[PDB]
Write a protein that binds this ligand. Sequence first.
Ligand SMILES: CCCCCCCCCCCC(=O)SCCNC(=O)CCNC(=O)[C@H](O)C(C)(C)COP(=O)(O)O
Lengths: 125, 55, 58, 443, 108, 88, 546, 64, 157, 117
Amino acid sequence: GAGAPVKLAPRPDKPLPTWYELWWDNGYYPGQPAADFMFGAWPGNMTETYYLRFWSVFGLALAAPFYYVANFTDETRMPMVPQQYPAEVRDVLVQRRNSMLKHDFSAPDFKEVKDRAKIYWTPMY
Amino acid sequence: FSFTDATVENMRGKHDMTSGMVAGAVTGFLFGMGRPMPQPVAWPLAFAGAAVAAD
Amino acid sequence: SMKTLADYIRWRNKEPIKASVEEWRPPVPVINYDKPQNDVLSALDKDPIVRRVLINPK
Amino acid sequence: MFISVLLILFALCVTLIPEAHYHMVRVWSFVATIIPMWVVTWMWWNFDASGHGLQMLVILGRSHLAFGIDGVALSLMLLTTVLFPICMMLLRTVAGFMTFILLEVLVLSALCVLDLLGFYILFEASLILLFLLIGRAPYGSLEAAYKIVLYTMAGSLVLLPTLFMIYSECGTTNVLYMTCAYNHQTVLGWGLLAVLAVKIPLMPVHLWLPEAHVAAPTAGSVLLAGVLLKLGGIGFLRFMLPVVPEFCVSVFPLVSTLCLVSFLFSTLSTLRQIDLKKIVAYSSIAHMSMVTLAIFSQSEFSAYSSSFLMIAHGLISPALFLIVGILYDRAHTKFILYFSGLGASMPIGSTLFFLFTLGNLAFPLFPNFIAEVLCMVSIFAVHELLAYVFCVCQVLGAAYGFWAFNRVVHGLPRGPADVTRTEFHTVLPLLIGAVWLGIKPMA
Amino acid sequence: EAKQFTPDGKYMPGIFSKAKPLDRSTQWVHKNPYIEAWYYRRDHFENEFVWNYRTTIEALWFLGGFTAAAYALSVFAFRQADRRSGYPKRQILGDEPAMVLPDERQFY
Amino acid sequence: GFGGGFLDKDSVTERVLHVTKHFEKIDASKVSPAASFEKDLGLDSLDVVELVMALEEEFGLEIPDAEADKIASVGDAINYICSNPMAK
Amino acid sequence: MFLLSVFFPLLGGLVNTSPIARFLGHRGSSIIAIGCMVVAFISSVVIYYEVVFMGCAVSVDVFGTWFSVGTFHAGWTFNFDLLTANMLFTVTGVSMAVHMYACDYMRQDPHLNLFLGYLSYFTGFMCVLVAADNLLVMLVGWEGIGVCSYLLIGYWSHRLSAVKSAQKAILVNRVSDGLLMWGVLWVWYHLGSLEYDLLNVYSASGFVGLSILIGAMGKSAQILFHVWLADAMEGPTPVSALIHAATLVTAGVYLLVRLHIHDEMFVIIVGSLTAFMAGVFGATQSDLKRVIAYSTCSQLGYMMVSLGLGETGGEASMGHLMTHASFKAALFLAAGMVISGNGGNQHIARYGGSAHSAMFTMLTLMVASLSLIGWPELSGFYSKETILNLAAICADPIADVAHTLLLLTAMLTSAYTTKLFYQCFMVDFSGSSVTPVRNVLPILAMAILLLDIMLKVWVGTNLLSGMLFFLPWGVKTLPFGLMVAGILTATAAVGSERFTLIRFCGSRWGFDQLFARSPVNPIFDLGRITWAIGDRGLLSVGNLRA
Amino acid sequence: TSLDHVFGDNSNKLNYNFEPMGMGSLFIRTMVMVGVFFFPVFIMINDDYKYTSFLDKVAAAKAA
Amino acid sequence: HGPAQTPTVFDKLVEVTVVDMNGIRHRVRGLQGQSLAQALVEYGFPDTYFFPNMGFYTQHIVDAHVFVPKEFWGKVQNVDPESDDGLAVKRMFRDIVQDYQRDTSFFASYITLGAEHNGMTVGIGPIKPWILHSEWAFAGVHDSRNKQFDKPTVEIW
Amino acid sequence: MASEVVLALPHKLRVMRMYRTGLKELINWSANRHEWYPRAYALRQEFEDSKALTDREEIRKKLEHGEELLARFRHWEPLIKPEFVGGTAYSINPAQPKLKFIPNYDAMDEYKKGDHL
Ligand SMILES: CCCCCCCCCCCC(=O)SCCNC(=O)CCNC(=O)[C@H](O)C(C)(C)COP(=O)(O)O
């Protein structure tokens, strides 16, 4: 059902703002700013202070289990060791840093295996 | 200008353009004190740049 | 009062003049209630009126 | 040389044509620029990539004027000779024909120069031509011409003492002996950096171009956009690296930081532009800064990547200028808020606007994409931080590009109808060239 | 409704035609005075500069500050690239005489 | 069909009358074209607002607030509808 | 038969956008598009059968090199492995039905043929992306599908909201693409080649995985990048269906699976967070399209977690993609049919009864909902349970948080999906539109989608389905019980009194507002400062009056 | 104006002053953007700092 | 467009009473949009009553020295004293007038006549001797019969 | 609190718009119209408890409290008809405004279609 009548945007009749290059006028009413929420009202009339206040606790509430589990529990929590493979087969699989087989605490070179698994960022010369 | 330049030269025990920069900044500040305020920064810049160019 | 070089320098230190003539505004749709809200806890969220008109009815 | 002199005399015959027979006037003026395009084609067919790094060598006695061809000069000549006939197609006066003929002659002569004094003399012989072009009485701005002419003269005057000092130091002005003598690299290096940082738009001394390229008409706009900035890059490649390397090295942090801040500020400044022509003006600055950093990187293939990017901009940006000129001439204004609903009004023209906008934004199936990939390869091999800085702000240019495109194209239809046969023909060479170089540039 | 052509081509300028002749200026817009004033002001915004508090603060903290940041970053990148190729300290502009341009004939 | 996006007078009048009679206080015989809401039908401001919303539902319209405030009688509403190309 | 899978949709789209389309009309354009889609689908089916079942990978020299300067060599070369075959088969099967639906949905649109041509371009460039053997062709496909999405979203160039949404999505994807380009630079500088088969890594410099994952998240609309997806509903229903089923959103996960060079911790954290956010987002709205988009985001997070688990997890994630695409497109198409039967109403609060729409659409929506929520012995059931079991046995203590988060997310998924179906049909009628459209072609498209869903069960995606992993009996039954709990709560359709949490959840956590003024308005201010203060100010050189 | 009685007039006026952002807020958010979107710079620099600290400890202990 | 009266010069006719330096009144007819001094030349004033403009890119413009009574002061188009054009005007005051300056001293080149200027009365202001180049000078004596209107050209060179 | 334009409304009109927008919001927070009916009846009744109020201070207190309640409860996702302002179907495909056409422009004034200089 195309062809619905649409209101136009009447041309301005008073001196323009210095920084008028943020109101998007496509020729039809209603226009909009350059981006939503940038100025004027927000749906629900909420403010940035409201959301900052809420996030100040919500973020830590979400993040807290991550730190606790990453800093107070180790691979001994799992009641089994990872999938086993022969030496000539495992020796290549664990070379990957992303490879999960490093978490076998029963590995003959377990601490050494975890030692190689650390991540660097700048290539060293 | 001359007094401050030689002062810095003796103070630093060596010769470079920095002493001229200090002399130019001081000269511009002394010249620029008590005037409207695009000046007290500009005049030391002018004198210091002149000293740098001279070196 | 020494006539000096700076007297010929057009120092860029004159405040620009604006005008009191009304500026343009694009029309925007009306919002009946657009008071900026800032509180997470507001007793209005536990207002008995809201209970009576929303939660109490069957 | 003989052929070149024949073309030089043949081009001058325009003034000798009586104005009564306008048809033949247009024919002669167009053909005079047509011929060098075929001549450069013949040169490219004559070149040997298995031969020396320089071929077709010629020297005019003790009169300096050393002319030789590399890949960079040949490619730049090809691009320019493609550009110029379109510019001729947009002029209506004999004076414009003569000015652009002289400009093309000067550009071609400088493009293959091998004498630093020769480059100095031949390059800025067009400054008065640009001055007369930009500040035309009915529509031009005298201030823009004043600006650009003063900037160019300041650069040349800074360079000249260095040029004569190295001349006296080595007893000559040929590059192949200037490159072989010990010299006080620092002073000549400052001179070269000053000139080629004025010519190529580099912050802080770059402000002439936004006024100049906008005040000029369409033909001169395309000329200035696609040619004179590349005179800076070929200037670097042909002179500065072969002659004074130590200055190039010790200035590398300065050049890199200046290019980076130029790119960043130009990219951010563009969004606040309110005119399409000014938007196109700021667009070229980032490309030139990227070219300069690629040249200065010298990591793996810097010269070739820089040449590729120069060709890509000299191909795409003139199309943006063509669209801007068509819209202005058939609209009598360049102000954005008078552009709307262009797609329904100018379907093919708006499609071309979209395509060349994407071309400016380095998208695949376009030479600009491969160009920026190679430039970032060169930058990355030197260091990864500079490459990241170039990579991170890719969104910020496309931001203003898409915003302006959508604002002027979509919405309420109002303004001119679509393009004409002449306008589509003017657009055509850039589209075909961009497609050809974005699909199979090499073989 | 005019006739700017003949039945066999031959564009007629129609100087003495009552009807308004279609031309290059046919689709010109009607300029809005406020828009023209705004565009002149923005093209001539240079007269609005002043050394106020805000302008100076912004110029120093952003423009010069990020200039210094990029300069120091370039110095860091250059020195790190030198160290990642086995080269000793190199002489930047104003860095005392030192090694420049490592020879192609030396293994570093 | 009929109308440049507009419906007939008669079905609009019939729909408005049919909507109007949905009040306990209202006697049917006193509803007629161009009838006063308050003075004739004796409906309060809440009733007028409810009738505006109900007619908006019936004709599928989102009436602007000022125009709704202008609505104070049957004939005004009918003529307003007779101006709407957006009414179904 | 091999190059037919890629070149044929491209040629069809070119014809549909060529001046030749002037001489055909919408009837002919629909015929050409449907024929091209069917032929490419047949070729893709043959390639899938041969590759998956008989293990025959084929490499193609197409146009010679693209550009080879220095040690950098880029070639127009195509290779078809199990991954490429799966991607091509899924994309073609989706887009064929998408084209079938679009041939009928937009029948009263003026410029239908342009819409068809852009859809064909989108499908062809997706095929180009998946056909890539080296990273440059992957980039080409990435940007081509981005351009096609830009054109398709901004199809109705007369609505400013759609234009804003398209520009926002393009800029976000361009940020992701810059990150991806930096990653590609690193990959070539430290590996010397671009072909994936020549990319075998054990321990990189970290930035590789980080940048690649960020670029992938940009396309997959993960956490910190999901805002664009909801606004994409401004476009026509076929565009949203095609984008959310097998293209664009899938490309990031496809690249990650092809690469397998990520870092497990960051992948798992991002995936779990995104899944939780999508789950809480989907149950808190009233626009039908936005809920399905957020469900798409949640399934993307599921796939992210799976691929972060390991190689087996990566293959399970690929199977999850393969099963998800079909019913995602089915949900989009059924929603579009119901909306059209509701006079363009795109809000749930005006639905109800069994009079507005056809029986087949209702049954298709029911089947798609059942499959998506993991109803026992179904398409999404197998993949979701496999990912859950592989996530219930991970060696990372980090994953324990992810397992609980995904359990909650699945329960919320069942919740809002059952609420969707309930508001669509179970509730009493509360709107004003009944035009039940019973055209053959969209019904046949739904039939094809449902047949593919049946095939995904009757024939497994990989060997993982049926591989039993040893869990306590309660653990396996846990997602089943969670879906039951969601069913019960949604069929209750009850709500809470804590209205501040409601207003927070409905706002999409204010992320759009946060990005409106933390980066964006400061970018504008930096632009004004640069231009005015520097150029016309500090960098300005004035005139010497005389 | 022929559609005002259908879709609203131009009576209501936008409440925007067109003014530059708060200086301190603008500065803080610029720094936040720089930190979020230039993390590789800090990562590389901190890597170099850790590396030179390692070298410094080695130098201190190796000469005694 | 209707019965609007035909356009006649009367509707744009402007009359100004001009009195010479010898105290002789003279009737002059002026036209809207043109400068006063152009009409003054058109009347037959001696060449000594005029002088080149002392500005840049305007030295081909003639002018005469006149006195503006108090009422018509506001009809003189404004000129920036800080402008380069204003600097040229101040050079004109500095050189041509010297101690002939009066608070009513003005330049006719900046007088664009209009409806209000009808009936306005001004007189000629005295000037000091001057020289621009070889072909156009002022001896300081107003003894001549040659009409400035009779010069074929205005050679700045 | 309402907006400044609503602040300018007459007391009768102010309360009318208050009640109207309250019904709109109750629809906006409603699961269904069927849920909205008893809420509508209760909302109508609550105003009925304030019909006979005369002291303008307490009247203003009640009005202000209700306005604050409504402002706190602005719905983020309003229910709009598709083809009105803010609706999804608004501004999709309008009729083309009349645009003049220029025939055979290249044919006019040939050899003189360039640029002056
Ligand atoms: C989610 C819900 C949020 C809260 C919504 C607000 C709930 C609070 C409502 C309670 C406060 C009130 O009723 S507001 C108080 C309204 N009543 C009065 O002010 C006294 C009467 N004054 C009059 O002028 C007229 O009788 C008048 C009846 C106004 C006009 O009716 P008519 O023109 O026909 O004559």
